[PDB]
Amino acid sequence: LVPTVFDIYSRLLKERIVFLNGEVNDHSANLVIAQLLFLESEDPDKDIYFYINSPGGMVTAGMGVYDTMQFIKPDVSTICIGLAASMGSLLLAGGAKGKRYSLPSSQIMIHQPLGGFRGQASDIEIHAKNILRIKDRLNKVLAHHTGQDLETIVKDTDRDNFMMADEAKAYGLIDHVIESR
Amino acid sequence: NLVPTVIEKTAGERAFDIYSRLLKERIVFLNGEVNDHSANLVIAQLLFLESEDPDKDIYFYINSPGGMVTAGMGVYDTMQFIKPDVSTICIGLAASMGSLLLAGGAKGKRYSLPSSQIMIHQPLGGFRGQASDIEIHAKNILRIKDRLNKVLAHHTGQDLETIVKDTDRDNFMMADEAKAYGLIDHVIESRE
Amino acid sequence: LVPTVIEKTAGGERAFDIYSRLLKERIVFLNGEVNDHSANLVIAQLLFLESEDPDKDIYFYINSPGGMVTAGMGVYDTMQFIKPDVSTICIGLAASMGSLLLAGGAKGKRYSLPSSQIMIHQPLGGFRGQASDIEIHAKNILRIKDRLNKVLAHHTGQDLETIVKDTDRDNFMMADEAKAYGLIDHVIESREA
Amino acid sequence: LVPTVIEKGERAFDIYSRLLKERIVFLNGEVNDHSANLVIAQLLFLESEDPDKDIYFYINSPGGMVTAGMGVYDTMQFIKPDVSTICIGLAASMGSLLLAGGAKGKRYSLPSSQIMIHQPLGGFRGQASDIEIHAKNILRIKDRLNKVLAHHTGQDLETIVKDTDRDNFMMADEAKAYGLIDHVIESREA
Amino acid sequence: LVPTVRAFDIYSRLLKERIVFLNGEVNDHSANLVIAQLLFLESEDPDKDIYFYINSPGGMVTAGMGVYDTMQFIKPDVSTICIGLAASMGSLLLAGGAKGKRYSLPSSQIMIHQPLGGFRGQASDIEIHAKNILRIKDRLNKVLAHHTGQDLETIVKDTDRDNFMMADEAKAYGLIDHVIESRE
Amino acid sequence: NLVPTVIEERAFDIYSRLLKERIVFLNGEVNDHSANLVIAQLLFLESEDPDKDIYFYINSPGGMVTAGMGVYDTMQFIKPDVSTICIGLAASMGSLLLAGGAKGKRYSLPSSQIMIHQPLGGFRGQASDIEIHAKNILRIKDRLNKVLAHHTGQDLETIVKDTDRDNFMMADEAKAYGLIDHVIESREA
Amino acid sequence: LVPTVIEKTAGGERAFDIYSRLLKERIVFLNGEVNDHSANLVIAQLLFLESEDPDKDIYFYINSPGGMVTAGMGVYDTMQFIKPDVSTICIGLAASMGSLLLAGGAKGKRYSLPSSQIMIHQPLGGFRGQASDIEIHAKNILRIKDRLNKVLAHHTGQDLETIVKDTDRDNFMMADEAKAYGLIDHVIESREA
Amino acid sequence: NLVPTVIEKTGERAFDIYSRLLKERIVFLNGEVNDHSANLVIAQLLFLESEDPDKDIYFYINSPGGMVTAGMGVYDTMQFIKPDVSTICIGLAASMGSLLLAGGAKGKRYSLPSSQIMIHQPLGGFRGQASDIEIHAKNILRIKDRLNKVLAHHTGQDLETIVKDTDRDNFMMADEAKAYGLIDHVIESRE
Amino acid sequence: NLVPTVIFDIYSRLLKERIVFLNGEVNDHSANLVIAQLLFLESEDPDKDIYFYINSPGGMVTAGMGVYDTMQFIKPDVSTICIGLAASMGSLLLAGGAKGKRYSLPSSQIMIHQPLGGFRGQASDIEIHAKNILRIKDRLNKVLAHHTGQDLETIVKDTDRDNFMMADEAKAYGLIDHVIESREAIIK
Amino acid sequence: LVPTVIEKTAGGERAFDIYSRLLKERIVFLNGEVNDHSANLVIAQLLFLESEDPDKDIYFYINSPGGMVTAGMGVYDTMQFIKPDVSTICIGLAASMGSLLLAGGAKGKRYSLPSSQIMIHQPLGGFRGQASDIEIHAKNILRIKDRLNKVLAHHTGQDLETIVKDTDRDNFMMADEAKAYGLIDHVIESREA
């Protein structure tokens, strides 16, 4: 449990450090959003350092974080410190141009969305078409931030695609692999 | 209480349960949910009865809320395949696959008792996984929906689009309404 | 020879049990909940007894709290459809669909033993989903309620309005009250009388 | 596993159907729709076999469902044969009612049996209007059952009411004195 | 599962030789099956002995006392033979066999105790049930005293807690008449 | 990963710190707990200043109608304009709250999912009681449809048609529909 | 200084939360089920506010499906007992005991926001045991039903027979219908108007 | 919703509402009587006596009862301490709850008008050997007798009247409870 | 898969050759079935050997000692053969077969140990149950000593913990008399 | 008069099923897990078939993932003890104790169908308790591991050192690989062969 120094996360927050750690859900996404807005209110020009260690989770929650990162005035530098899978890798890749990093041993994984629905065929169809629109949007977001063609992203996310940091840098998901300060 | 037995005296004795005894009278029941077990038992009985006599009618008594479409469509196809006319009689509920099986009985030989509930609908399903697989299964269930609607259209004489409109939500019908719609041929109250 | 037992342990057991013995005398039981299994078994017995002799009474002994209306109305319809008169006899409880089946026995041949409980009520149902589907299921159950009230009115001789009033809440009757109401024709205490 | 008896061609009987040939019927364990109906079926069967020969109804029951049990009671009174009753362990609640409802002079207990009488148990949850309907009903049931006990025992209704307010356990000899049975029997030769 | 051996299951074949088993818990089902077998054997021949093999930890007192009473009621002598355990109501049934005809195999475990029970509810009802179980305790002690020949006070002292006896100890105490090691 | 603290001398949870900027979140399901907390924040902010705008951020799949309609009514009742901003999902009761924001001050970030549909309910009992509850949910459905019509500018008929089954919209489509006024991508706009 | 939070995670937490802030403005919430916990908390707040000032109104905001009658009638009684007028405002749902508490606010000071659901009904109960005890509990619940009807009659100005008729089954009302019925005094849409 | 806080200016200090009402010598029993709830009441009673041994305490009761041993500790503490403990029923006082209500200081036992008061005999339960069953049955009869004696003493009723009237659950309205002696006053309005 | 038939189930057919199986745990059901079979076979022919095939991890001591006593009591010699496992009461029953007529197949696992028990309650009752299991332990050790020809002291030492033996080791110890691999081989 | 069924419901059901009819052709199945029940039934069948004819081959069809070693080794030993050759035939899977039994069939009469999966490995076990007892059970399973490897070495003709190496982890083989390894003698695809 969290030592005092402030709790340590609150102390690091005052140096513009924000963590996403574990699953992306409504609670974790919203906490990140709250910290980003707070940091922008404190100083709208200073960079923010967003440390990501996440297997992903809820797309709608995560796209809230993604959007807030683009919306606020501060550049949001992203740093992968373990795993950045699924929505986690989207958040990593959506950091500020030239300010997307990973530590050398991190796993970065990209895939297509997961979902499901039970009900009448009419409703299955509505939800199927929705997740296909989401799939298309997430692919377009990755294409944008990575510099890959959409067709490359579509092919490369059809199944789970695990990359090491150096592969992820080459692919355009990050800008730098950093080993020491 | 479980199924009773009848003893038939032989030149000793044989025992038959009541359903086995009524099978001798070419009576077959679908009772309760349609699943692989229940559908296959009906199919086996239908095939047996055709083997015993290919030309005599079979009397298929239906009380079902439906269930698995693939299991049920085996029954439907078997009913059409075999040479005997399969008369259908709704004796309580014919819902979903139940009503499809009722409507699929031999021309002019689809019956309901007067208080039966008939219900027609669109198929239910579900799948969890990747967007690609969700699309595969969604496409499949839409094809199944279309096929089931075409079957209903064929046997009722309704336009396909009328069946589509009328099955978009659960549609409950009384026996007389089911007759008027073409899901059955006769509402019967007394043997006479 | 086929072995004799008190009760079969499974439907396909090759043994002649007490219920099979009494089926030979044209006695059929509904015992416990009305559901697809119990209702269909009664229907099979009624069709069989009809095929054995279309012109001999059937004695339908009822002890049931009711249960599924669709299953139960299949039994009610079969009772009216077949050629034999189906005499009904309440031997403990006839509630809800149980009382409907009791009251649907052949004219003048509806009986209760003296201590039986008879209860009439309006149907119970339930549905969860979209408002559109709630409305569909509501309209259906109201139609069913109306149909059942008309069945009871027919067999009892009561006006429809009286049936509606008296089934709004659970209505418990002793056997003599059930006779007076028209749900049965006779209360019987001894075979000799 | 129920043992088999073969009788001379030849027919196998379960032990209970073998005893059924001697017009012996058991109620064993809880009174419910299953057990009550099985008893009723056997009584109807034995009447059909012979309407004048006595039936011997052995009871070992803690009671159970009143409606199911009252079907057995009414069937006992209805059929032409006298239904002798014999308590072989416990007759409690509906069990003791069925025991006491046996034919006049032919209600027995073995010497170590426990016989218990009490008032009806019920339960209901719902609207106050419905609670009242069900309460009124169970009071009517309580009254009926007390009148049945009064009838078969010879006790005044007021005594039955007093004595069944709470569980009332009696030894076989005490049940005989009370009028719930006619005889305690310890050996066949006596 | 039960082998077949006229074709019977093995218990039915042994029943034909007047052999009856109580195996496992005494409850309404198991007690009643024994009763049915005893009444059947009496009907078949009222004079011939019955051999009642017991291996049971006991169980329901009321179910057990029906068996005990039936044993005393029927005309046949009911020899009892412990072939494993005879504890609680099991030992009462062993001890209640015909005078001189209560046996045990040499390694059997015999155990006697006071009744177990319990009840929850209003104090008035607790008292009613407590009073009842005390009468049951008294009756069962009198049954054991009668069949063993011990004084009532001795039975009371010796059943206050679980009292385990070996077959020779059970014989000396009067719970059985003979310990039998071989037929020959 | 729990709630960070900000010190201004007094400690604030991050959410109370943002409450000083008149920012309020609805996050996750609408239920009595979450709704009541929003209502309390709105009443508080009104008491702090009845004229200053309130910024109500919504990321919700909806939930209990009665709970949610309390939030809706409070939004309309208090003097401050309640600006609404969709930051992920606004589905069902969530989209109603979004669409109920002050005229001209209803926003979404570009990637949000907005979904509208008809009410869900459920009842078990006597036919008489089934009918009572059915009549009630139909009145609720009608009232919710008239609320959407009012705030969107769509005719009632269009709202009824478009909410019969789940209807998902991207932020720009929700804007064109009248559920929001602006899609915002960058603070400099 | 005492830290500020949106909501306390525990009762004894040393922080000043949104509810604490509004309690300073004499605002009290009943939110969710009426049970011993929620009821007692409202009572404590009412007693505290009376002790702070016996001559200033309290604003009691209600969003509740009801629940335990004994707990809720403590709140009702406390509202009547204390010197301050307790204004009631429905802010989502006021059903069963919730609607009684709403209707029990100070004369002329009972409000609803426009979209609130108000529902009145008869009490719900349950008991299992001996017939004697069933009768005791039935008699009690009927007395409770009668008292609650008399309370509703008193605050609404409806006659007792009207209340009895109208609460026999669940009776759902919109805010305007509740005002017409006398369960509230005003439907309020905007603070300005 | 959880207990709110009040800030008192000094810096600042925080109290929850129950802690704030404890300053006004108000103590609550709310919900089931168990070791936790009973002991917390006892601790508040002892604390209030320490703060002022002569000023009344106001003990608000809304309880279905519960554990007799835990509750009889509260009962004894109420009699033992120097301050009068006024009791006020604010919803339900059943079983041990009614005993605690009835055991308030003479003349200072109150109910609000709609409260439900219920008196009964004790509930218990035990499983084991007949010997131990007897031991526990004897104990609960003695507890039954002692609780009836407590009620007789505080109500003024004859013991046998209490015995008769608690054999089954006995529900009383506040006015009936006053007539019976379980409380002294039904109060509708502070004024 | 379930017991097949011949125009008898397979076990009934083998019972005609006086073959009785103990297979799986020793409990009241399995023990009593063995006893019923032994009594039956004795009554059919009291002079012919009975062959008792054992594959059992043991189980309840009272149930199993009924089988032990019945094996000694009846007139037929009860030959035993281990056809998989004979552990705990399984090994005791194997060892208790007729002198010279106890066998094992070659790969069988024999295991001997002391009794397992358990009790919760008052100290007085714990003492009673403890005293009883100690007497049972003694009796079972004396039974093994008798059939193996080992001294009691050796049995105690070797059963203090689970003691696993291969068939040849069990034979050397006296728990069986012969290890048999082929029906055609001379019995050694 | 003994009725015919595809499969028996119970052990002592009086019906002549598909397996009984095949047992008349000296066909015996091990299907599914090796445990006391499945092993003992195979043993019973092997002894029966030996009594019916001591010379004729037995056809032991194996589709098994393995299971309990003690139970399985009783089947193995019985196969070696009885007079008639037990030919083994893999019809799906022969894994762990399944493959040992496959490989333990009579010389030259061990078969597989072409698509079967054969898997060999070392023993799985487990024990919890005192360190002394852990050592006892560890020593025992190591002895079992040794004997089982020696059994595979004997029937395959592989050296012990090869079997130890190749069973250290799960080793899956197709039918042709298993023949080449010596676990079977022939892979059979057609009746005409």
Numbering used by the authors:
A (entry chain P): 6 to 10, 21 to 196
B (entry chain M): 5 to 15, 17 to 197
C (entry chain N), G (entry chain U), J (entry chain K): 6 to 198
D (entry chain H): 6 to 13, 17 to 198
E (entry chain I): 6 to 10, 19 to 197
F (entry chain O): 5 to 12, 18 to 198
H (entry chain T): 5 to 14, 17 to 197
I (entry chain J): 5 to 11, 21 to 201
Give the authors' words.
Caseinolytic proteases are large oligomeric assemblies responsible for maintaining protein homeostasis in bacteria and in so doing influence a wide range of biological processes. The functional assembly involves three chaperones together with the oligomeric caseinolytic protease catalytic subunit P (ClpP). This protease represents a potential target for therapeutic intervention in pathogenic bacteria. Here, we detail an efficient protocol for production of recombinant ClpP from Francisella tularensis, and the structural characterization of three crystal forms which grow under similar conditions.
One crystal form reveals a compressed state of the ClpP tetradecamer and two forms an open state. A comparison of the two types of structure infers that differences at the enzyme active site result from a conformational change involving a highly localized disorder‐order transition of a β‐strand α‐helix combination. This transition occurs at a subunit‐subunit interface.
